[PDB]
Design an enzyme around this catalytic site. Structure first.
Site, PDB file in Angstrom:
ATOM      1  N   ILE A   1      29.935  28.673  23.321  1.00  0.00           N
ATOM      2  CA  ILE A   1      31.274  28.210  22.976  1.00  0.00           C
ATOM      3  C   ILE A   1      32.096  28.119  24.254  1.00  0.00           C
ATOM      4  O   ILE A   1      32.178  29.090  25.016  1.00  0.00           O
ATOM      5  CB  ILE A   1      31.947  29.141  21.951  1.00  0.00           C
ATOM      6  CG1 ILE A   1      31.368  28.904  20.555  1.00  0.00           C
ATOM      7  CG2 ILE A   1      33.453  28.939  21.946  1.00  0.00           C
ATOM      8  CD1 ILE A   1      31.841  27.623  19.905  1.00  0.00           C
ATOM      9  N   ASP A   2      32.700  26.958  24.486  1.00  0.00           N
ATOM     10  CA  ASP A   2      33.520  26.739  25.665  1.00  0.00           C
ATOM     11  C   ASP A   2      34.961  27.181  25.407  1.00  0.00           C
ATOM     12  O   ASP A   2      35.349  27.513  24.284  1.00  0.00           O
ATOM     13  CB  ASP A   2      33.475  25.269  26.079  1.00  0.00           C
ATOM     14  CG  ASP A   2      33.737  25.071  27.558  1.00  0.00           C
ATOM     15  OD1 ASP A   2      34.439  25.913  28.157  1.00  0.00           O
ATOM     16  OD2 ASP A   2      33.243  24.072  28.121  1.00  0.00           O
ATOM     17  N   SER A   3      35.761  27.185  26.478  1.00  0.00           N
ATOM     18  CA  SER A   3      37.157  27.596  26.363  1.00  0.00           C
ATOM     19  C   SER A   3      37.949  26.646  25.469  1.00  0.00           C
ATOM     20  O   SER A   3      38.782  27.089  24.668  1.00  0.00           O
ATOM     21  CB  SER A   3      37.791  27.682  27.752  1.00  0.00           C
ATOM     22  OG  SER A   3      37.650  26.461  28.456  1.00  0.00           O
TER      23      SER A   3
ATOM     24  N   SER B   1      36.748  24.969  23.005  1.00  0.00           N
ATOM     25  CA  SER B   1      36.363  25.341  21.650  1.00  0.00           C
ATOM     26  C   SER B   1      37.127  26.570  21.176  1.00  0.00           C
ATOM     27  O   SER B   1      37.505  26.650  20.002  1.00  0.00           O
ATOM     28  CB  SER B   1      34.856  25.585  21.580  1.00  0.00           C
ATOM     29  OG  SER B   1      34.139  24.418  21.943  1.00  0.00           O
ATOM     30  N   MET B   2      37.369  27.532  22.070  1.00  0.00           N
ATOM     31  CA  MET B   2      38.182  28.689  21.705  1.00  0.00           C
ATOM     32  C   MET B   2      39.601  28.272  21.346  1.00  0.00           C
ATOM     33  O   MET B   2      40.191  28.798  20.395  1.00  0.00           O
ATOM     34  CB  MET B   2      38.195  29.705  22.847  1.00  0.00           C
ATOM     35  CG  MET B   2      36.822  30.217  23.245  1.00  0.00           C
ATOM     36  SD  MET B   2      36.124  31.397  22.074  1.00  0.00           S
ATOM     37  CE  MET B   2      37.597  32.217  21.470  1.00  0.00           C
TER      38      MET B   2
END
Lengths: 726, 84
Positions: B38-40, B42-43
């Site tokens: 999960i990428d930033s 996506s966060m």
């Protein structure tokens, strides 16, 4: 329970197809082709109310030299000094030309008169020129027919060895422009179709789908061109080369965009596991109103452009609107039927691959998190392009905007090889009195007037009765310089340098003022003054161009705003949609100016901005309208999530449509009319900038920053009644 | 109030909607970036979506150090059950 219109369209698809095919065949069979109609119904390039046209008509009427303002020049050039055989050829050619009377209204002989022999001889005595007045105004079919007949007559006789003949003037240039426009139209059609083929094949990765796209596009183009040709056949409207080229290219591109929108929506809807009927109904209910609004916007913009004073934009106006209306109706009626019929056959229109759903969602998240700096950077990028405004400069003459192989250009070069340029475009001045000038007072008055005219800076040469070059023998000049009734006199003016630049245009007012001042203090006071020439013709256009541009540009914004308000039913969204494109215009203008004027070394013609701006605005509003329409659907779950979902769901389709449309419009570079290339390239870069920055980084940022105020006067909520954990 | 299972189910639904990972493959011990991939951005998407649907304000300052799912649910229950 399904909506009425899509159900009725789906049920009766085959009769719709058959009716459209029959109508297209009847239109294309009964009436002739578009090119012949356009050639038959050309329009004059100068308004009939212009002072120069009226003055030239008076010049012709008083001296019994016809009534048309057209003129042609025949140039004899040889490598050796002219001889007696040349004189014999010249006089027999003059007699043969005078034999005809339907086209050749009149001509002036100066080389056959020993008194005025030096008037046509060169400094080295290697060239000669003769002026012949044609019938019909410049740019219309009569002038073209007359110049073609003159060329045919002058070519039928073999010239003596060592010399050649040429025809120059504005009428020949306009005829060559018409022919070049036709050939350019053919080449442009071929190139555009090739580009569409390759781009569609690259994007969709399926031969059958691309074949279906081309079927729809070809049917639409045939229908619109046949309809316009039929309308023009009955003398309803005028036409020109620019109108035909714009109509064809714009119709092809708009049909391609509509097909891309519809089928992209269909494939996206089906990708979620829905059946075929559900996908068809979904695409119709999601795209019908958007397509109709975009078409009406383009038609209204063109009709607003039709409120000008110059003949070119006036002829541009109506046929473009009619073509757009026909194209939109054909798309809306034919697309769904073809799609349903093909999709019912099992496997024809199934999706192949998923394009992008992650990158656009990430872009939307980044926009939502930090809207402020993104908006500021976008505004700065928009303004830096407009920063280069004060360097703008326009050009007027069309001689260097055409290929050099045309006969008119060759004749101009041959004349300039021995003569000055301004000698090919003389000016005619008439002073009209109420009595006869057969007493010494009037000749000395004419001498004073000629001296005053020559005193003006920028006038290379003046020709009058007393100075034919810079008693029956003397009586012969009376027939050429004075009216038979002896009530008016005329003078010939030859400029220095280029007679077409801004200085040449400005010199007309100065010379008129000098003539008026010279008239004062003389018994000829109260006399009438008339001027005729090319520079006088172009001065009126130069005066009216800016007012026509302003009046055409003001109303288009209001009409577009009204249409968007009707479609979206919210003031702020329509205002934002208009304002973003209004701001983005500057970057396109600056980029086009930088590419053309500074690097390539060629200035911009004065017909470019007027046609460019309206098309730019009309096309650029549609992408924002589609994005807002999608966001209105997706907002029901919350603005923050709605923006992300809309960006994810309608990101790639708009990109593909924008690149396709821009690359179609950028194919004008192959044209041999450089004005067409300039217009096409300008639209291309402008729409590349619009589809890469404005659509993706300004409107969503503004919407997120504004929040619920974006949908005034409607009422919406930002957080929709938070729910407990499941 | 709010139990572990409900928060886990909601977060799993959000993950499935966003990145497409099956909701049966999420446990509190797993990590977002080392395991869940999960990428930033996506966060940020997850935070926005969970703020709109249910309502939780997680500033990025303390969201940067938020790594697993167990600390996520601990923060959620601390903010929710302990009503200010």
């Amino acid at each position: 329970a399904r909506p009425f219109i899509p159900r009725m369209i789906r049920t009766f698809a085959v009769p719709i197809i058959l009716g459209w095919l029959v109508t297209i065949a009847v239109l294309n069979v009964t009436v002739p082709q578009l090119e012949t109609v356009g050639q038959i119904q050309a329009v004059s390039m100068s308004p009939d109310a212009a002072p120069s046209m009226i003055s030239m008509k008076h010049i012709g009427k008083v001296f019994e030299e016809g009534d048309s303002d057209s003129a042609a020049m025949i140039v004899l050039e040889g490598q050796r000094p002219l001889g007696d055989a040349a004189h014999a050829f010249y006089d027999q050619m003059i007699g043969r030309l005078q034999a005809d009377t339907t086209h050749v209204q009149s001509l002036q002989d100066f080389w056959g008169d020993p008194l005025t022999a030096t008037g046509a001889q060169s400094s080295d005595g290697k060239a000669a020129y003769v002026q012949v007045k044609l019938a019909g105004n410049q740019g219309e079919s009569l002038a073209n027919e007359s110049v073609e007949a003159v060329k045919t007559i002058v070519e039928r006789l073999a010239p003596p060895p060592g010399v050649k003949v040429y025809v120059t003037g504005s009428a020949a240039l306009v005829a060559d422009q018409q022919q070049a426009g036709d050939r350019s139209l053919q080449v442009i059609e071929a190139v555009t179709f090739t580009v569409i083929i390759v781009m569609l094949l690259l994007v969709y990765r399926s031969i059958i789908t691309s074949a279906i796209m081309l079927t729809m596009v070809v049917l639409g183009l045939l229908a619109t061109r046949g309809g316009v040709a039929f309308l023009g056949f009955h003398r309803i409207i005028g036409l020109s080369t620019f109108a035909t080229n714009l109509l064809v290219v714009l119709a092809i591109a708009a049909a391609t965009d509509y097909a891309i929108f519809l089928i992209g929506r269909y494939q996206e809807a089906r990708g979620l596991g829905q059946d075929r009927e559900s996908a068809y109904y979904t695409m119709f209910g999601g795209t019908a109103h958007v397509v109709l609004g975009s078409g009406l916007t383009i038609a209204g913009a063109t009709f607003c452009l039709s409120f000008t004073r110059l003949p070119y934009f006036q002829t541009l106006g109506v046929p473009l609107a009619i073509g757009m209306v026909i194209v939109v109706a054909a798309a809306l009626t034919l697309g769904p039927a073809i799609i349903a019929v093909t999709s019912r056959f099992g496997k024809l229109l199934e999706p192949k691959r998923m394009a992008r759903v992650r990158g656009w969602r990430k872009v939307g998240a980044a926009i939502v998190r930090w809207p402020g700096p993104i908006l500021v950077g976008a505004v700065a990028l928009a303004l830096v392009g407009l920063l280069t405004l004060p360097g703008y400069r326009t050009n007027y003459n069309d001689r260097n905007y055409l290929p050099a192989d045309l006969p008119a250009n060759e004749g101009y070069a041959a004349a300039e090889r021995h003569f000055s340029q301004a000698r090919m475009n003389p000016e005619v001045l008439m002073v009209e009195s109420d009595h006869d000038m057969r007493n010494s007072a009037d000749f000395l008055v004419i001498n004073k007037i000629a001296k005053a005219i020559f005193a003006v800076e920028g006038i290379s040469r003046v020709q009058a009765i007393t100075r034919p070059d810079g008693n029956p023998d003397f009586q012969r000049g009376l027939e050429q310089f004075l009216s038979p009734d002896g009530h008016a006199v005329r003078f010939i003016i030859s400029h220095e340098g280029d007679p077409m630049s801004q200085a040449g245009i400005a010199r007309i007012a100065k010379i008129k003022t000098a003539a008026k001042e010279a008239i004062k203090g003389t018994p000829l006071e109260g006399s009438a003054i008339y001027l005729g020439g090319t520079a006088a013709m172009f001065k009126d256009l130069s005066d009216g161009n800016t007012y026509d541009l302003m009046i055409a540009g003001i109303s288009a914004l209001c009409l577009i705003f009204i249409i968007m308000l009707i479609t979206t039913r919210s003031v702020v969204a329509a205002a934002v949609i208009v304002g973003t494109v209004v701001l983005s215009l500057g970057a396109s203008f600056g980029l086009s100016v930088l590419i053309w004027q500074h690097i390539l070394g060629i200035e911009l013609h004065w017909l470019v901005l007027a046609m460019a701006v309206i098309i730019l605005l009309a096309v650029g509003a549609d992408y924002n309208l589609l994005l807002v329409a999608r966001l209105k659907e997706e907002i029901h779950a919350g603005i923050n999530t709605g923006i992300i979902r809309a960006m994810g769901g309608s990101g790639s389709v708009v990109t593909a449509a924008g690149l396709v449309f821009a690359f179609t419009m950028m194919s004008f570079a192959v044209s041999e009319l450089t004005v067409m290339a300039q217009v096409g390239t300008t639209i291309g870069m402008g729409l590349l900038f619009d589809t890469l920055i404005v659509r993706s980084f300004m409107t969503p940022s503004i919407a997120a920053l504004l929040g619920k105020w974006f949908w005034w006067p409607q009422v919406v909520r930002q957080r929709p009644i938070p729910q407990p954990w499941p | 109030a709010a139990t572990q299972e409900e928060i886990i189910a909601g977060l799993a639904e959000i993950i499935e909607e966003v990145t497409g990972i099956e909701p049966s493959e999420v446990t509190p011990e797993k990590s977002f970036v080392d395991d869940l991939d999960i990428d930033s951005l996506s966060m940020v998407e997850i935070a926005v979506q969970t703020e709109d649907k249910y309502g939780v304000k997680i500033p990025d300052e303390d969201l940067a150090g938020l790594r697993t799912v167990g600390d996520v649910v601990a923060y959620i229950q601390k903010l929710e059950e302990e009503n200010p």
